[PDB]
Design an enzyme around this catalytic site. Structure first.
Site, PDB file in Angstrom:
ATOM      1  N   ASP A 163      -4.376  83.151  44.150  1.00  0.00           N
ATOM      2  CA  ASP A 163      -3.225  83.565  44.039  1.00  0.00           C
ATOM      3  C   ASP A 163      -2.319  82.390  43.669  1.00  0.00           C
ATOM      4  O   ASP A 163      -2.092  81.275  44.377  1.00  0.00           O
ATOM      5  CB  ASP A 163      -2.654  84.314  45.203  1.00  0.00           C
ATOM      6  CG  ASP A 163      -1.392  85.059  44.977  1.00  0.00           C
ATOM      7  OD1 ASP A 163      -0.562  84.688  44.427  1.00  0.00           O
ATOM      8  OD2 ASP A 163      -1.415  86.142  45.091  1.00  0.00           O
TER       9      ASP A 163
ATOM     10  N   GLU B 290       3.222  88.427  36.460  1.00  0.00           N
ATOM     11  CA  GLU B 290       1.891  88.888  36.073  1.00  0.00           C
ATOM     12  C   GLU B 290       0.765  88.399  36.419  1.00  0.00           C
ATOM     13  O   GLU B 290       0.685  87.352  36.412  1.00  0.00           O
ATOM     14  CB  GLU B 290       1.791  89.256  34.654  1.00  0.00           C
ATOM     15  CG  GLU B 290       0.724  89.848  33.897  1.00  0.00           C
ATOM     16  CD  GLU B 290       0.463  91.152  34.218  1.00  0.00           C
ATOM     17  OE1 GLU B 290       1.734  92.116  33.722  1.00  0.00           O
ATOM     18  OE2 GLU B 290      -0.420  91.695  34.803  1.00  0.00           O
TER      19      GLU B 290
ATOM     20  N   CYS C 185       2.819  93.960  37.450  1.00  0.00           N
ATOM     21  CA  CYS C 185       1.571  94.392  36.696  1.00  0.00           C
ATOM     22  C   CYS C 185       1.648  95.495  35.809  1.00  0.00           C
ATOM     23  O   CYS C 185       1.695  96.539  35.880  1.00  0.00           O
ATOM     24  CB  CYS C 185       0.710  95.137  37.993  1.00  0.00           C
ATOM     25  SG  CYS C 185      -0.894  95.643  37.292  1.00  0.00           S
TER      26      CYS C 185
ATOM     27  N   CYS D   3      -1.087  99.086  42.035  1.00  0.00           N
ATOM     28  CA  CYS D   3       0.674  98.769  41.860  1.00  0.00           C
ATOM     29  C   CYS D   3       1.548  99.794  41.677  1.00  0.00           C
ATOM     30  O   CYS D   3       2.430 100.155  42.373  1.00  0.00           O
ATOM     31  CB  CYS D   3       0.572  97.412  40.923  1.00  0.00           C
ATOM     32  SG  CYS D   3      -0.607  96.105  41.267  1.00  0.00           S
TER      33      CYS D   3
ATOM     34  N   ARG E 267       1.358  83.197  43.076  1.00  0.00           N
ATOM     35  CA  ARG E 267       2.681  83.731  42.947  1.00  0.00           C
ATOM     36  C   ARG E 267       3.848  82.682  43.895  1.00  0.00           C
ATOM     37  O   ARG E 267       4.949  83.192  43.558  1.00  0.00           O
ATOM     38  CB  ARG E 267       2.851  85.120  43.408  1.00  0.00           C
ATOM     39  CG  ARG E 267       1.891  85.984  42.278  1.00  0.00           C
ATOM     40  CD  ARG E 267       2.002  87.406  42.882  1.00  0.00           C
ATOM     41  NE  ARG E 267       0.862  87.670  43.849  1.00  0.00           N
ATOM     42  CZ  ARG E 267       0.848  88.800  44.254  1.00  0.00           C
ATOM     43  NH1 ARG E 267       1.614  89.494  44.285  1.00  0.00           N
ATOM     44  NH2 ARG E 267      -0.393  89.010  45.234  1.00  0.00           N
TER      45      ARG E 267
ATOM     46  N   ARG F  54      11.014  97.006  49.176  1.00  0.00           N
ATOM     47  CA  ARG F  54       9.924  96.288  48.470  1.00  0.00           C
ATOM     48  C   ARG F  54      10.081  95.416  47.522  1.00  0.00           C
ATOM     49  O   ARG F  54      11.147  95.422  46.649  1.00  0.00           O
ATOM     50  CB  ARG F  54       9.103  97.487  47.699  1.00  0.00           C
ATOM     51  CG  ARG F  54       7.482  96.912  46.984  1.00  0.00           C
ATOM     52  CD  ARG F  54       6.715  97.970  46.644  1.00  0.00           C
ATOM     53  NE  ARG F  54       5.480  97.437  45.811  1.00  0.00           N
ATOM     54  CZ  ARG F  54       4.446  96.737  46.401  1.00  0.00           C
ATOM     55  NH1 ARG F  54       4.471  96.545  47.858  1.00  0.00           N
ATOM     56  NH2 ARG F  54       3.625  96.066  45.668  1.00  0.00           N
ATOM     57  N   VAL F  55       9.313  94.186  47.439  1.00  0.00           N
ATOM     58  CA  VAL F  55       9.268  93.222  46.541  1.00  0.00           C
ATOM     59  C   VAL F  55       7.930  93.535  45.781  1.00  0.00           C
ATOM     60  O   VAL F  55       7.074  93.262  46.352  1.00  0.00           O
ATOM     61  CB  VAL F  55       9.458  91.687  47.148  1.00  0.00           C
ATOM     62  CG1 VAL F  55       9.307  90.787  45.699  1.00  0.00           C
ATOM     63  CG2 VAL F  55      10.802  91.432  47.752  1.00  0.00           C
TER      64      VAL F  55
ATOM     65  N   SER G 107       5.146  97.608  51.926  1.00  0.00           N
ATOM     66  CA  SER G 107       4.650  96.311  51.377  1.00  0.00           C
ATOM     67  C   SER G 107       3.308  96.050  52.596  1.00  0.00           C
ATOM     68  O   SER G 107       3.685  96.409  53.692  1.00  0.00           O
ATOM     69  CB  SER G 107       5.383  95.221  51.145  1.00  0.00           C
ATOM     70  OG  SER G 107       4.712  94.152  51.072  1.00  0.00           O
TER      71      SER G 107
ATOM     72  N   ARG H 208      -0.810  87.640  39.587  1.00  0.00           N
ATOM     73  CA  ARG H 208      -0.865  86.551  40.541  1.00  0.00           C
ATOM     74  C   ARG H 208      -0.184  85.429  39.903  1.00  0.00           C
ATOM     75  O   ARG H 208      -0.514  84.144  40.321  1.00  0.00           O
ATOM     76  CB  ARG H 208      -2.137  86.454  41.146  1.00  0.00           C
ATOM     77  CG  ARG H 208      -2.828  87.639  41.702  1.00  0.00           C
ATOM     78  CD  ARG H 208      -4.028  87.396  42.371  1.00  0.00           C
ATOM     79  NE  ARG H 208      -4.388  88.223  43.475  1.00  0.00           N
ATOM     80  CZ  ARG H 208      -5.167  89.091  43.463  1.00  0.00           C
ATOM     81  NH1 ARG H 208      -6.197  89.565  42.401  1.00  0.00           N
ATOM     82  NH2 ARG H 208      -5.198  90.028  44.562  1.00  0.00           N
TER      83      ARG H 208
END
Ligand SMILES: O=c1ccn([C@H]2C[C@H](O)[C@@H](COP(=O)(O)OP(=O)(O)OP(=O)(O)O)O2)c(=O)[nH]1
Ligand SMILES: O=c1ccn([C@H]2C[C@H](O)[C@@H](COP(=O)(O)OP(=O)(O)OP(=O)(O)O)O2)c(=O)[nH]1
Ligand SMILES: [Zn+2]
Ligand SMILES: [Zn+2]
Lengths: 397, 399
Positions: free
Chosen positions: B310, B270, B228, B241, B312, B223-224, B334, B272
């Site tokens: 978003d 944090e 949060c 999360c 990110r 998982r990446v 994910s 997005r």
């Protein structure tokens, strides 16, 4: 059409003037730097890739705080609040005219509500230590809180005074030690306000935010500095998350008895050395001749970092003053650095609540023993030189 | 004296690549824009201004070396494969021993150590019989044995720019402008290619043997996770999360227990990558809007405040995977199509996608996960329709 003046510490918003740190109109900018801490870099990526227009301004409709905090006298006492903007949560209200006039003003604080469910609180309920009341704590284990995210806003002359150096030296060193970040630190002495690209903090309030300003209501508080590897991942080398969740438990009971609770969660990972430096020290600790001993704990950081700690707790009480906090009946914390800062700022601390021995994780003895030997509050015995030389730390595996 | 050592990004060997010299003990040696430690250079500066830290201090790296040998791998020198971290950043003391001795003050941008992580959700997994201690990966205490690596950001501006399909000079001008002029060298020093931005990095948690990450014959569960704080730490029931994080950790432990290997990457983005203030503002508007907190309004509420949904930029997120030699993810814990597209787009095979079980969705996170599914996030079966997305699923304020 020009840039609004800022009179830090003025008693009204109008006189104080808005922090204009956006970039939609650079003739309006009246600070050094930009909003959102680190995340200005990601905003730049969003602009450069086409996803976001460099002209976008926030629509602040319906974003205003869920709870009214202040104004309080501390907001206008000279030198009292220098590292956050006391008006930062209410810009849409107190700077409505400036906004309509064309000044793109962003909030640097946001206030909302949540239900926080912590497994340690659910266990506290299962074990009869906490009992849901339906107001502060639900049977699900959820606690009802107000939370405020607070981004940094530095009045450089105030910060300088806080640190006992001249403003020009502070600004020169900020410029030089970051490899020349923001030449206006040395080039624009007329700009007094700096928005550093650092994390801020989050305040969790249990009960009524307005009772924080009433020293007749019993206040339980902890200021917690971020430790990701424990606060999130529960590594057993340190006390952090156990202390955080113990404080949360104490704050809930405080509210339930009719008081109010406060947890401030400040982004200062690894004593504000960051996590790389923190992990290097762990490795050096475990590999040193003689094993991982409490009497070498601080020396191992010193050898890598040149200092023991870079959190500068002398700016940590600003959030308390912003909230009107004038007295802490129960400080859930041991650090003499935090205690001196809080009390040195005028705030009485009545009871200091140390971390109960049974919450110390299996490889956190070295840390907590070194800390008590260094002056952290404890009601019991302070480890002497002989106890500090015991190899209390676990081997590398 | 000596000038600044050249940097050839992605060169086949550490010597040809050149060390990242981002310290300030000698300005003539600096060969990048910025300084080490992400945000924390500001605090270092404060420590020097206050007189607590000497500006001549240099790290004693004795005994700091990685606990686990990671790489080198071919991906460390494939053109444009790793542009947002320094693949040599964990081993400078070894691979730049010469340059250190020639007087170049070189810091690691990566640290690799070990730990016992004890998560309450893992303890409960044991009580419920989802997990069973084996003594080697998982202890009866609930402690899981991990290797963990803290990675701080090191950006190759030409490579970053390409990754975003824009010119390098456009990227550098916009970084300069949109930060309010943070580092003029972005536009003033086109000869410097490497940028140490004042942002958080990431931490990788490895369950099993890091060398297995480079072996696609070993089953990798990964998982990446993007930071949060209000859930990962404080467990707010508005979002998925921490349930997703700790579910993934459970799956990684099990994967290692069966002879595989697990990976959790925890990246500092944090809200997005909008930050937490913008995030809280959007929560308020979600709950006060006409018609209530509904999933068909979830993304619109963020766009009105932030101008985008978003920030990110998952386009840079696979870099750490390539640094670890990952060529295949057998179980990707994910749902994000953004993450999946970046991972597979970057050449990493993904076999099974593991969605968040319905029963782990918190009480006020229904709006979030429905909106995400309707927006294209992976789900094994049906996506919600126009109705359903219009149900007032979100709790009222106070509520
Ligand atoms: O070995 C260690 C010990 C501590 N920290 C960091 C994390 C953060 O910067 C602080 C975390 O806990 P807390 O916020 O509660 O601060 P404290 O100094 O321990 O005081 P106290 O817990 O008594 O309030 O120490 C490390 O990085 N490595
Ligand atoms: O309402 C919300 C929803 C999401 N986030 C942010 C927090 C972080 O930026 C990320 C949380 O964790 P994760 O790293 O697992 O990302 P994701 O997009 O949901 O994809 P997936 O969970 O399917 O892997 O989303 C918010 O701030 N507010
Ligand atoms: Zn810790
Ligand atoms: Zn979340």
């Amino acid at each position: 059409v020009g840039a609004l003046p800022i009179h830090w510490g003025a008693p009204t918003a109008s006189e104080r003037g808005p922090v204009v740190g956006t970039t939609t109109n650079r003739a309006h900018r009246n600070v050094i730097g930009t909003h959102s801490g680190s995340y200005s870099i990601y905003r730049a990526l969003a602009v450069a890739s086409g996803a976001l227009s460099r002209h976008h301004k926030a629509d602040l409709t319906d974003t205003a705080p869920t709870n009214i905090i202040g104004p309080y006298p501390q907001w206008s006492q000279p030198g009292k609040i220098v590292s956050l903007d006391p008006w930062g949560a209410t810009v849409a209200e107190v700077f409505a005219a400036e906004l309509a006039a064309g000044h793109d003003i962003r909030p640097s604080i946001a206030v909302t509500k949540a239900h926080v469910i912590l497994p340690e609180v659910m266990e506290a309920i299962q074990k009869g230590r906490l009992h849901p009341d339906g107001r502060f704590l639900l049977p699900s284990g959820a606690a009802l809180v107000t939370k405020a995210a607070i981004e940094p806003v530095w009045h450089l002359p105030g910060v300088a005074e806080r640190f006992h150096c001249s403003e020009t030296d502070l600004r020169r060193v900020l410029f030089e030690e970051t490899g020349g970040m923001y030449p206006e630190l040395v080039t624009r002495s007329d700009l007094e306000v700096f928005l550093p690209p650092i994390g801020g903090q989050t305040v969790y309030i249990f009960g009524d935010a307005r009772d924080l300003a009433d020293p007749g209501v019993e206040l339980t508080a902890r200021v917690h500095d971020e430790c990701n590897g424990s606060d999130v991942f529960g590594s057993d080398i340190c006390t952090c998350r156990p202390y955080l969740t113990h404080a949360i438990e104490e704050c809930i009971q405080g509210a339930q008895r009719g008081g109010v609770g406060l947890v401030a969660y400040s982004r200062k990972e690894g004593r504000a050395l960051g996590e790389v430096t923190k992990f290097l020290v762990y490795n050096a600790r475990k590999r040193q001749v003689g094993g991982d001993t409490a009497d070498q704990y601080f020396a191992r950081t010193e050898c890598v970092a040149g200092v023991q700690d870079m959190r500068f707790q002398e700016m940590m009480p600003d959030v308390l003053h912003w909230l009107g906090v004038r007295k802490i009946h129960r400080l859930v914390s041991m650090s003499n650095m935090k205690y001196d800062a809080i009390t040195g700022s005028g705030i009485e601390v009545v009871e200091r609540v140390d971390l109960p021995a049974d919450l110390i994780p299996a490889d956190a003895r070295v840390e907590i023993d070194a800390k008590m030997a260094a002056g952290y509050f404890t009601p019991g015995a302070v480890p002497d030189a002989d106890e500090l030389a015991k190899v209390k730390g676990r081997e590398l595996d």
